[PDB]
């Protein structure tokens, strides 16, 4: 397996990946099969994938693969919940109770880790919940005063707004920081050709703000991604 490291400059995958994380990615592999007598690397649903931005292939993006080839994906912008129908059958999708997250967003915008007992001026506390897609559980953040404007979505020819059917060999990507993520909702599907790898680990983390320099080290974050 071939490996590549990446810095996380933005907040689009909070709380799973933070600004200032450094991650290791495992590149996807074409299988090496002996037809006389490895397996081909594909995203599984829920995988954190690095990929080349389709519209400008010189930029690397990192999102979660929530939609696989054939998936009918529907997003309800009010509840901020996905529905997924594979091979279009309904994928089991569950959501936990909303609770206050560790983060406040100021509003460009910055994010701050603020303890749940405190408050911060010019800020909104982000909510957190668990999203389960099939067999994979991960956290998402939502901004309680935010809601997508569906008229601004990438609209797939043939489809109502806020519903997409993933073409063969393509993926529907979404960020865990659901109100702060420019993802497939807005710029459409990601082709197979554009995938780089799957995020496997945080190998280093620096405590910093989006444009600022590091305030410290978050060694507690080194390890698996969950």
């Amino acid at each position: 397996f071939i490996y590549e490291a990446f810095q996380i400059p933005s907040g689009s995958m909070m709380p799973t990946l933070l600004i200032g994380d450094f991650i290791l990615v495992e590149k996807f592999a074409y299988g090496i099969k002996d037809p006389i007598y490895i397996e081909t690397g594909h995203p599984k649903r829920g995988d954190i994938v690095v990929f080349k931005y389709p519209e400008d292939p010189k930029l690397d993006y990192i999102k979660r693969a929530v939609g696989l080839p054939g998936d009918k994906v529907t997003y309800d912008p009010v509840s901020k919940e996905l529905t997924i129908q594979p091979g279009c059958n309904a994928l089991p999708v569950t959501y936990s109770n909303v609770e206050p997250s560790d983060f406040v967003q100021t509003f460009t915008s910055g994010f701050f880790e603020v303890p749940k007992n405190e408050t911060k001026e010019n800020g909104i506390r982000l909510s957190e919940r668990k999203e389960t897609l099939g067999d994979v559980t991960h956290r998402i953040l939502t901004v309680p005063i935010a809601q997508d404007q569906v008229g601004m979505y990438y609209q797939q020819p043939g489809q109502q707004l806020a519903t997409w059917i993933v073409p063969p060999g393509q993926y529907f990507m979404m960020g865990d920081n659901r109100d702060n993520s420019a993802d497939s909702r807005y710029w459409g599907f990601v082709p197979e050709a554009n995938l780089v790898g799957r995020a496997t680990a945080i190998w280093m983390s620096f405590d910093k703000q989006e444009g600022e320099w590091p305030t410290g080290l978050r060694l507690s974050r080194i390890g698996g991604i969950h």
Partner: peptide
């Protein structure tokens, strides 16, 4: 690498 992912 060491490059960024947005």
């Amino acid at each position: 690498x060491x490059g960024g992912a947005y």
